Design a binder for these strands. Structure first.
Lengths: 108, 149, 125, 60, 206, 78, 95
RNA sequence: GUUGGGCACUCUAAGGUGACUGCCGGUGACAAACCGGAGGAAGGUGGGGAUGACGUCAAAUCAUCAUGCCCCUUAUGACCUGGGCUACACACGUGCUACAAUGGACAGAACAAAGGGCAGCGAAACCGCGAGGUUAAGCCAAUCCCACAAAUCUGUUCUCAGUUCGGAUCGCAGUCUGCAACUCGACUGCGUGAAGCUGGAAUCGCUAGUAAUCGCGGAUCAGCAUGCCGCGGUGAAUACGUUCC
């Protein structure tokens, strides 16, 4: 399926494309204008023309494994160079500058 | 101190009843009479459609099935924890009926409270239903504790 | 042109009852064009239904302030006042219905140390 | 540290963002009202002593 | 946590503003200029027993009225008093100062001078019963429908400091038409700091 | 810091350009932590003041888009 | 000639309003009356206590109310009368 | 409502009038008072506020201030930069956001009060997806601006799932303020999307324009608000009663 990962057949296109790692709502609406599917179809109901345009538009976009590997490269970069922000990446303490005597409970 | 009383508004533009606007003021979440009026009239239009009757009489029949004669109050003397049954005065009969309609309707679960209130009125009409479990159980609690009156 | 002012909940309506057939005109718009939720439409019509005023005056209303139910209260109060100025007769009917009260239930002033003019924040021992 | 800190505020610092509001009657920052150029407690005292020509007790 | 000061409570009902003008563009600056004025004039005439200073602001001009309860200590020989008073104010403010000095007949009804008269006697080591009772007789004969003098601090007694009420007549702090003079004064004695609070119910307006 | 430029202090820029006009030298004791890293800093070992000591850090190709005080935590913890 | 008095007391501003009203009315300037204009008031809420007690406050109020005076006919006798009106510091004439 | 025109109306802000158990009937001692009625905008201190008695806790404040005594003095005082008061395994008060169809998203229509603005408020136009940006009108303000109110109502859409719920966290790219946003700012844009499906023992608030909910405003302040202080919008449920805490 489209980027090597599924989209659900029984949703609309705008939100079935959200389940691809790298496309949210607004890049999905930027796609389907360029593709011309008019945002009101199931993806169980498309044509091979109409879904192939979606495929190669997304092939032009930085989506599936590129995003994960490059964001891991950024995180490993500022872990390895030193970089207190990567120290927060490592330890499980919040990165953006946030109080830690209380919650900080996404990270530990 | 002494007892204080309250008021309520007479009509509804369709279904001209006091108590139906009393149900409108009930089930109001966060100060929205508009949403409760929409839920109520769309529900009664379902009750007029799904059963070919006027929904006023079905609604009063559902009320008559739910309105409890006997609450069971509390009375703890010593270490006893007795519950004591009370003949309910009819204002509280109507308002306990409306609470049980509203609570067990939204506790049921369907694809709008339009449908839940409609099906809860349709169940409380032909008495077997979810709020009428609470009606029956309160009368059973009064039946068990009848030794005190 | 009988004229009456109605005040309700920081809203003021100016109801002029012209001799007509029953059109109510709220700021050059009509009723449901400006007031939805027809419980307000039946409540706004109650002085005109208690005494028989059903099709004998068109209504022209200049409203400002408050919200839509506040404007409903201001319009019905202005109707009852201008409709007393029309005929002094049925003042007992309006007074038994309210309609010469101007419900003075203004929203209370917030107090210090309270959240919302009665609300205490939360108590912990 | 009072007369030193008052004197330092009465100076012009290196930068305008180092500039902060201060008492003018009873030396402290934290709650100097911009209109009166006065500390909060000193405003209550003087406004009680019939000075500060606008302010009386508020009620509405 | 106790009583609101009655001076600040009856501002804008019957008791006027001391400082009377209108704000133009330097309201803070006019205020603190007048605070410097009142400090300077109350320090200089705390010998000459001045109670209250009312300041005007009259388009580059300031009319200061002064309630003293004696004229000829403060207007004096005529020349010297107005020289040393208007001249230094014209300097330390920077513009014209006019000085009008109203004299308080019945010097024992103005609570600032009364509280200072009790404070000086504590500093003159007069006993703290004699000060308040003597002054209450003086005020109630000078004509007042009630007086209350309350002194607190170390009264010459070391490890316990307590408050002392003396009063005669009605001092009704809750009647909002009262015309009550309230005034504090402080007395720095060898044992510490004493606080004199005098307030004089003088009569109400119908 | 958007389109006005990057930020550095003028004194640290002066010291680094004196260091760069001939060749590298010993560490630069520098209290400025606020300053970004220009690409012309790379190789210059500089001593950032953490609050109580001067920590030496050697600047690389990656350590550019950040600032100096990212390479000196100020709070010791366990 | 649009004199907007603004004061802290209503009685002082009323006195200084009808003084301009009468002195311009006596020399034929056709005085439109003292139009009372909405007050700008400010409320300053303050912790009563020195140190603690955020719950213990006191609210203070500063009202400045203003009234508008217009002089329509030229009549420079009225202007010479206004220039010698000595009315106190409370009111702030601004023509 | 722009103009001419008008002070009728709203509004504004001054002086008033006005509600006092005053009048009726009833009870009670005939009193004091109480229950209902008529009038009335207002009915029984009409709603609120301000007002906080003698004193209680050697309560709190020597850090707002002033202070007696004791201590320091080329330092327990002063300047300067950098950090910290934002640490974090843990507990714990107060709050905000949700867990969803009375919902979410998208489009249309309306209704407010109160307050702020002079080196400040800043229209309109232009550009930028957006945060915002450039030139600049008007405004020392019932004029002009902040200021395009939001829940709401009306159509379209999903269909009961960890989702078209929720937004944490985080990467990248930006914007504004300011010497400077690394520790340590708010906001935007793209993307990732977590715990959470209404909460154990226990426990809190509220008697009416109140609680619940929705936005707006202002102090503080260059910038930082989920806090506080006010404002309106919609707007309930119940009080048998004093058995118990």
């Amino acid at each position: 399926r489209i980027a090597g990962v599924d989209i659900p057949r029984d949703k609309r296109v705008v939100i079935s494309l959200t389940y691809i790692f790298g496309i949210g709502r607004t890049t999905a609406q930027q796609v389907l204008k360029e593709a011309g599917v008019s945002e009101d179809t199931r993806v169980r109901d498309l044509t091979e023309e109409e879904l192939g345009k979606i495929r190669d538009i997304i092939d032009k976009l930085k989506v599936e494994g590129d995003l994960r590997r490059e964001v891991s490269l950024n995180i490993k970069r500022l872990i390895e160079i030193g970089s207190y922000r990567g120290i927060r990446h490592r330890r499980g303490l919040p990165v953006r500058g946030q109080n830690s005597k209380n919650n900080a409970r996404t990270r530990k | 101190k002494g007892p204080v009383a309250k008021r309520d508004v007479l009509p509804d533009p369709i279904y001209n009843s006091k108590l139906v606007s009393r149900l409108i003021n009930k089930m109001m979440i966060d100060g929205k009479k508009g949403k409760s009026q929409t839920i109520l009239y769309k529900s009664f239009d379902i009750i007029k459609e799904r059963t070919g009757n006027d929904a006023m009489e079905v609604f009063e029949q559902a009320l008559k099935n739910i309105m409890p004669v006997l609450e069971v109050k509390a009375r703890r003397v010593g270490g006893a924890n007795y519950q004591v049954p009370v003949e309910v005065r009819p204002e509280r009969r109507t308002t306990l009926g409306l609470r049980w309609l509203v609570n067990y309707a939204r506790l049921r679960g369907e694809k709008t409270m339009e449908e839940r209130l409609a099906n809860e009125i349709l169940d409380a009409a032909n008495n077997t239903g979810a709020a009428v479990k609470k009606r029956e159980d309160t009368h059973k609690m009064a039946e068990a504790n009848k030794a005190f009156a | 042109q009988y004229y009456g002012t109605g005040r309700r909940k920081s809203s003021v309506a100016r109801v002029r009852l012209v001799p007509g057939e029953g059109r109510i005109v709220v700021n050059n718009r009509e009723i449901s064009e400006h007031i939805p939720s027809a419980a307000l439409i039946e409540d706004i019509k109650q002085p005109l239904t208690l005494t028989e005023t059903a099709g004998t005056y068109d209504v022209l209303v200049n409203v400002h302030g408050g919200g839509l139910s506040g404007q409903a209260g201001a319009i019905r109060h202005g109707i009852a006042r201008a409709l007393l100025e029309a005929d002094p007769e049925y003042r007992t009917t309006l007074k038994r219905a309210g309609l010469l009260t101007r419900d003075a239930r203004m929203k209370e002033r917030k107090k210090y140390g309270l959240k919302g003019a009665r609300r205490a924040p939360q108590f912990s021992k | 540290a009072k007369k030193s800190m008052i004197a330092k505020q009465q100076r012009t610092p290196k930068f305008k963002v180092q500039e902060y509001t201060r008492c003018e009657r009873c030396g402290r920052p934290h709650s100097v009202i911009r209109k009166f150029k006065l500390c909060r407690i000193c405003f209550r005292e003087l406004a009680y002593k019939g000075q500060i020509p606008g302010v009386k007790k508020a009620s509405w | 946590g106790q009583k609101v000061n009655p001076v600040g409570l009856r501002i804008g009902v019957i008791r006027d503003w001391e400082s009377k003008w209108y704000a133009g563009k330097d309201y803070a600056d006019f205020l603190h200029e007048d605070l410097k004025i009142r400090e300077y004039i109350s320090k200089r005439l705390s010998d000459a027993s001045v109670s209250k200073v009312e300041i005007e602001r009259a388009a580059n001009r300031v009319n200061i009225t002064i309630h003293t309860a004696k004229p000829g200590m403060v207007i004096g020989k005529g020349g010297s008093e107005v020289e040393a008073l208007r001249k230094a104010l014209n300097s330390l403010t920077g513009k014209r100062v006019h000085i009008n000095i109203l004299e308080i007949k019945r010097a024992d009804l103005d609570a600032q001078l009364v509280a200072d008269n009790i404070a000086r006697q504590l500093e003159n080591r007069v006993s703290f019963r004699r000060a308040q009772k003597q002054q209450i007789q003086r005020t109630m004969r000078a004509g007042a429908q009630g007086v209350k003098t309350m002194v607190s601090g170390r009264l010459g007694g070391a490890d316990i400091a307590r408050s002392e009420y003396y009063s005669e007549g009605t001092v009704p702090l809750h009647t909002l038409r009262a015309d009550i003079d309230y005034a504090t004064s402080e007395a720095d004695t060898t044992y510490g700091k004493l606080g004199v609070k005098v307030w004089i119910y003088r009569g109400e307006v119908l | 810091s958007l389109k006005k430029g990057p930020f550095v202090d003028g004194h640290l820029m002066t010291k680094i350009e004196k260091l760069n006009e001939t060749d590298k030298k010993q560490v630069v004791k520098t209290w400025s932590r606020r300053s970004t890293i220009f690409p012309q800093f790379i190789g210059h070992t500089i001593a950032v003041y953490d609050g109580r000591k001067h920590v030496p850090v050697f600047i690389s190709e990656d350590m550019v888009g950040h600032k100096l005080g990212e390479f000196a935590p100020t709070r010791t913890y366990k | 000639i649009r004199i907007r008095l603004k004061a802290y007391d209503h009685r002082i501003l009323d006195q200084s309003a009808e003084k301009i009203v009468e002195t311009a009315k006596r020399s034929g300037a056709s005085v439109s009356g003292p139009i009372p204009l909405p007050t700008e008031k400010s409320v300053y809420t303050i912790l009563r206590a020195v140190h603690k007690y955020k719950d213990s406050r006191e609210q203070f109020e500063m009202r400045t109310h203003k009234r508008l005076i217009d002089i329509v006919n030229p009549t420079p006798q009225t202007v010479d009368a206004l220039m010698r009106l000595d009315l106190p510091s409370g009111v702030d004439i601004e023509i």
